[PDB]
Short mmCIF file of C-alpha atoms in Angstrom, two decimals:
data_model
loop_
_atom_site.label_atom_id
_atom_site.label_comp_id
_atom_site.label_asym_id
_atom_site.label_seq_id
_atom_site.Cartn_x
_atom_site.Cartn_y
_atom_site.Cartn_z
CA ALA A 1 2.51 17.57 -4.27
CA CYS A 2 4.76 15.20 -2.28
CA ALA A 3 5.27 11.54 -1.16
CA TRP A 4 2.99 10.25 1.59
CA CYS A 5 5.79 8.80 3.78
CA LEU A 6 6.71 9.88 7.33
CA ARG A 7 10.54 9.87 7.54
CA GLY A 8 12.66 11.38 4.77
CA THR A 9 13.36 14.11 2.24
CA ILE A 10 10.71 13.19 -0.45
CA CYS A 11 8.04 13.01 2.30
CA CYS A 12 5.62 15.89 2.91
CA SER A 13 6.97 18.28 5.57
CA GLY A 14 10.14 16.11 5.83
CA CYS B 1 -5.26 -15.24 -2.40
CA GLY B 2 -7.78 -12.45 -1.88
CA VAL B 3 -10.38 -14.15 0.40
CA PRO B 4 -9.77 -13.40 4.15
CA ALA B 5 -10.85 -15.93 6.81
CA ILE B 6 -12.43 -12.91 8.59
CA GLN B 7 -14.87 -11.06 6.30
CA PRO B 8 -14.39 -7.32 6.12
CA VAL B 9 -17.38 -5.00 6.87
CA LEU B 10 -17.62 -1.55 5.22
CA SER B 11 -19.99 1.43 5.78
CA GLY B 12 -22.47 1.50 2.87
CA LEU B 13 -21.40 -1.81 1.31
CA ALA C 1 -2.54 15.35 13.94
CA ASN C 2 -1.09 12.05 15.15
CA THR C 3 -1.15 8.38 14.13
CA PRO C 4 -4.18 6.12 14.69
CA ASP C 5 -3.19 3.08 16.86
CA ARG C 6 -5.80 0.92 15.09
CA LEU C 7 -5.96 0.01 11.36
CA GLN C 8 -8.12 2.27 9.17
CA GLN C 9 -9.96 1.51 5.87
CA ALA C 10 -11.86 3.70 3.33
CA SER C 11 -13.91 3.21 0.10
CA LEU C 12 -13.10 5.28 -3.03
CA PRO C 13 -13.69 5.41 -6.85
CA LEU C 14 -11.04 5.00 -9.59
CA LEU C 15 -10.55 7.86 -12.07
CA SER C 16 -9.58 7.76 -15.76
CA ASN C 17 -6.14 9.22 -16.57
CA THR C 18 -8.10 11.88 -18.54
CA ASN C 19 -9.97 13.28 -15.49
CA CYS C 20 -6.99 12.83 -13.14
CA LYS C 21 -5.10 15.10 -15.54
CA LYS C 22 -7.63 17.90 -14.89
CA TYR C 23 -6.10 18.19 -11.36
CA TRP C 24 -2.47 17.00 -11.81
CA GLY C 25 -1.64 17.60 -15.53
CA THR C 26 1.68 16.25 -16.85
CA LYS C 27 2.75 14.68 -13.55
CA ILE C 28 0.51 11.72 -14.43
CA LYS C 29 2.56 8.94 -16.14
CA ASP C 30 1.55 5.62 -17.76
CA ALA C 31 2.60 3.61 -14.62
CA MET C 32 0.23 5.63 -12.36
CA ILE C 33 -3.47 5.38 -11.40
CA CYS C 34 -5.66 7.78 -9.37
CA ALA C 35 -8.51 7.19 -6.90
CA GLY C 36 -10.39 9.48 -4.48
CA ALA C 37 -11.68 13.07 -4.82
CA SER C 38 -14.77 11.67 -3.02
CA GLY C 39 -14.52 12.94 0.59
CA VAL C 40 -11.64 10.67 1.75
CA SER C 41 -7.83 10.52 1.29
CA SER C 42 -4.67 8.54 2.02
CA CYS C 43 -2.13 10.51 4.09
CA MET C 44 1.45 10.42 5.44
CA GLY C 45 2.23 6.98 6.89
CA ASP C 46 0.03 5.06 4.38
CA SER C 47 2.84 4.94 1.69
CA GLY C 48 3.57 1.45 0.32
CA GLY C 49 0.23 -0.10 1.38
CA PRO C 50 -2.59 -1.50 -0.81
CA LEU C 51 -5.45 -0.29 -2.98
CA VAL C 52 -7.66 -3.30 -3.80
CA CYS C 53 -10.57 -4.05 -6.19
CA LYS C 54 -12.68 -7.19 -6.75
CA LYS C 55 -11.84 -9.42 -9.73
CA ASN C 56 -13.71 -12.69 -10.16
CA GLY C 57 -14.80 -12.08 -6.56
CA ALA C 58 -11.24 -11.90 -5.10
CA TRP C 59 -9.51 -8.85 -3.64
CA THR C 60 -6.73 -7.91 -6.09
CA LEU C 61 -3.79 -5.45 -5.87
CA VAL C 62 -4.57 -2.61 -8.28
CA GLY C 63 -2.49 0.17 -6.66
CA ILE C 64 0.33 0.98 -4.17
CA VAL C 65 -0.02 4.15 -2.04
CA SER C 66 2.40 6.60 -3.66
CA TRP C 67 1.89 10.41 -3.53
CA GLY C 68 -0.63 13.27 -3.55
CA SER C 69 -1.62 16.66 -1.94
CA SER C 70 0.58 18.05 0.86
CA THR C 71 -2.50 18.77 3.04
CA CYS C 72 -4.30 15.44 2.29
CA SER C 73 -7.27 17.38 0.77
CA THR C 74 -10.36 15.16 0.41
CA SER C 75 -11.32 17.11 -2.75
CA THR C 76 -8.17 16.03 -4.64
CA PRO C 77 -7.49 12.49 -6.03
CA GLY C 78 -4.60 10.37 -4.71
CA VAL C 79 -1.92 8.81 -6.89
CA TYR C 80 -0.93 5.13 -6.77
CA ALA C 81 1.58 2.90 -8.64
CA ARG C 82 -0.26 0.95 -11.37
CA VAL C 83 0.39 -2.81 -10.66
CA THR C 84 -0.93 -3.99 -14.10
CA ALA C 85 1.87 -2.03 -15.86
CA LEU C 86 4.48 -3.41 -13.46
CA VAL C 87 3.35 -6.99 -12.87
CA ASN C 88 5.54 -8.68 -15.55
CA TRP C 89 8.58 -7.16 -13.83
CA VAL C 90 7.34 -8.67 -10.54
CA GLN C 91 7.08 -12.06 -12.31
CA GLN C 92 10.58 -11.98 -13.88
CA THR C 93 12.09 -11.09 -10.49
CA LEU C 94 10.37 -13.84 -8.46
CA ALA C 95 11.23 -16.36 -11.20
CA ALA C 96 14.98 -15.59 -11.14
CA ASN C 97 15.49 -15.14 -7.38
CA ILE D 1 -6.45 7.91 6.16
CA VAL D 2 -8.58 11.09 6.47
CA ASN D 3 -12.34 10.37 7.04
CA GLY D 4 -12.09 6.56 7.07
CA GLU D 5 -13.06 4.08 9.79
CA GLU D 6 -11.65 1.36 12.02
CA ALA D 7 -11.36 -2.03 10.29
CA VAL D 8 -12.81 -5.28 11.59
CA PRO D 9 -9.71 -6.77 13.39
CA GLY D 10 -7.85 -9.28 11.16
CA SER D 11 -9.93 -8.59 8.04
CA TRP D 12 -7.05 -7.27 5.87
CA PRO D 13 -4.59 -10.14 6.53
CA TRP D 14 -2.04 -9.02 3.90
CA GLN D 15 -1.46 -5.58 5.49
CA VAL D 16 2.02 -5.30 7.00
CA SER D 17 3.85 -2.58 8.96
CA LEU D 18 7.46 -1.73 8.07
CA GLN D 19 9.46 -0.60 11.14
CA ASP D 20 13.02 0.29 12.15
CA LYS D 21 14.86 -1.41 15.04
CA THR D 22 13.42 0.90 17.71
CA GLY D 23 9.94 -0.17 16.54
CA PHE D 24 9.03 3.05 14.68
CA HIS D 25 6.49 2.53 11.80
CA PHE D 26 7.50 4.36 8.58
CA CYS D 27 5.55 2.64 5.72
CA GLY D 28 3.13 -0.16 4.77
CA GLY D 29 3.32 -3.09 2.32
CA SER D 30 1.44 -6.19 1.07
CA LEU D 31 2.20 -9.95 1.33
CA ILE D 32 1.95 -11.85 -1.99
CA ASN D 33 3.16 -15.25 -0.69
CA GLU D 34 5.07 -16.75 2.25
CA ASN D 35 8.36 -15.19 1.07
CA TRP D 36 7.64 -11.85 -0.65
CA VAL D 37 6.25 -8.37 0.11
CA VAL D 38 5.36 -5.56 -2.33
CA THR D 39 5.86 -1.92 -1.23
CA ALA D 40 6.85 1.47 -2.73
CA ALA D 41 10.41 2.38 -3.88
CA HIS D 42 10.37 5.83 -2.17
CA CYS D 43 10.10 4.12 1.27
CA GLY D 44 13.84 3.24 1.10
CA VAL D 45 13.63 -0.09 2.97
CA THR D 46 17.03 -1.75 3.53
CA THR D 47 18.07 -5.04 5.27
CA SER D 48 18.18 -3.15 8.57
CA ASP D 49 14.37 -2.90 8.82
CA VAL D 50 11.68 -5.30 10.07
CA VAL D 51 8.45 -6.67 8.51
CA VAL D 52 5.58 -6.86 11.05
CA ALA D 53 2.54 -8.97 10.05
CA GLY D 54 -0.64 -9.91 11.92
CA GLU D 55 -0.99 -6.65 13.86
CA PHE D 56 -4.13 -4.55 14.51
CA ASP D 57 -3.50 -2.20 17.45
CA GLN D 58 -0.04 -0.65 17.49
CA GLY D 59 -0.53 0.45 21.11
CA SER D 60 -1.32 -2.99 22.61
CA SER D 61 0.02 -6.55 22.97
CA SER D 62 -3.30 -8.41 22.61
CA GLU D 63 -2.10 -9.75 19.21
CA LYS D 64 0.05 -12.62 17.88
CA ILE D 65 2.38 -10.69 15.58
CA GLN D 66 5.23 -12.01 13.42
CA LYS D 67 8.42 -9.97 13.13
CA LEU D 68 10.13 -11.01 9.90
CA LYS D 69 13.66 -10.26 8.65
CA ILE D 70 14.54 -9.06 5.16
CA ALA D 71 16.93 -11.15 2.98
CA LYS D 72 17.19 -8.70 0.03
CA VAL D 73 15.70 -5.53 -1.50
CA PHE D 74 14.85 -5.27 -5.21
CA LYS D 75 14.23 -1.67 -6.25
CA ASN D 76 12.82 -1.10 -9.76
CA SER D 77 15.68 0.24 -11.89
CA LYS D 78 13.33 2.56 -13.82
CA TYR D 79 12.35 4.29 -10.56
CA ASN D 80 12.66 8.04 -10.96
CA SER D 81 12.77 10.07 -7.75
CA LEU D 82 11.95 13.36 -9.55
CA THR D 83 8.71 12.12 -11.17
CA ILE D 84 8.01 9.43 -8.54
CA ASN D 85 7.52 7.02 -11.48
CA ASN D 86 7.85 3.21 -11.39
CA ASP D 87 7.44 3.39 -7.60
CA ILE D 88 7.64 -0.34 -6.76
CA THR D 89 10.00 -2.42 -4.62
CA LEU D 90 10.05 -6.14 -3.72
CA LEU D 91 11.18 -7.57 -0.35
CA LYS D 92 12.37 -11.16 -0.09
CA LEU D 93 12.04 -12.46 3.48
CA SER D 94 14.87 -14.41 5.11
CA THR D 95 12.28 -16.14 7.35
CA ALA D 96 8.95 -17.21 5.82
CA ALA D 97 5.62 -16.01 7.21
CA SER D 98 3.34 -18.81 8.41
CA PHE D 99 -0.14 -18.29 6.99
CA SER D 100 -3.11 -18.36 9.38
CA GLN D 101 -6.47 -16.77 10.22
CA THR D 102 -4.87 -13.27 10.39
CA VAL D 103 -1.92 -13.63 7.94
CA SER D 104 -2.14 -14.45 4.19
CA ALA D 105 -1.87 -13.10 0.64
CA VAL D 106 -3.49 -10.64 -1.79
CA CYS D 107 -3.98 -11.66 -5.48
CA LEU D 108 -1.83 -10.16 -8.24
CA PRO D 109 -3.61 -9.20 -11.53
CA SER D 110 -2.77 -10.12 -15.11
CA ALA D 111 -1.14 -7.34 -17.15
CA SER D 112 -4.25 -7.55 -19.35
CA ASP D 113 -6.98 -7.06 -16.67
CA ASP D 114 -9.27 -4.03 -16.96
CA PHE D 115 -10.44 -2.05 -13.94
CA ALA D 116 -12.99 0.45 -15.25
CA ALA D 117 -13.16 4.12 -14.21
CA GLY D 118 -15.78 4.52 -11.44
CA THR D 119 -15.34 1.10 -9.78
CA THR D 120 -15.51 1.26 -5.96
CA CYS D 121 -12.19 -0.01 -4.48
CA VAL D 122 -10.68 0.11 -0.94
CA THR D 123 -7.45 1.41 0.76
CA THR D 124 -5.97 0.58 4.21
CA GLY D 125 -3.20 1.87 6.55
CA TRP D 126 -2.04 3.51 9.83
CA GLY D 127 -1.36 7.01 8.42
CA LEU D 128 -2.40 10.48 9.75
CA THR D 129 -6.16 11.04 10.21
CA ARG D 130 -5.74 14.80 9.85
CA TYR D 131 -3.05 17.22 8.61
#
């Protein structure tokens, strides 16, 4: 379970 | 709002 | 596993908060809505974009791409910000700025 | 999007790409009028970033795109980064979009609208097509 962004610390796999 | 000039096409719709 | 150069689209059903809870439990809050579990999924890079449904014929903003499974599993529903529960805040803000 | 399909070019005219100064795409958003975009709060947009409207193919210049600048960022003050709750942010543009065949607005609902479980809806974006 994680945010579906690309760049950042809340994003999946960083 | 909500009515594009170019109509979308979708598979199965 | 890289980005598509051209814009993608996919069809998907809304869930009730009761069924969505069968997968995600207590992570589901009142300002959230789920769609998917149907063979498709949003994935990293889609964050902040639209989920739209027809109302009185017009395409209408029902969700904002928010979060879900870390492998983008097409068996699991995706989670979206619920615009109905946030739309009065939108209105105040526009009105005052 | 995993298991989706290419869109008809120009058919989702409210879809925008949010980019940094080097031109790297990090999130999407939606136009709601000539001056305002709706996106997610976790994206962390600031006034350094750019709003790109009217674009289809990110690898080609066969498009008339508009690069728009951000006047201010309104993050929802109930946004909780542990629960990812109240995940909404508004972007006011310092230069207005000019609406056309490939650039215009999505409707906003009433608070009172009802979208019933099991309705077929639609999602769009330029995210990963596989893990």
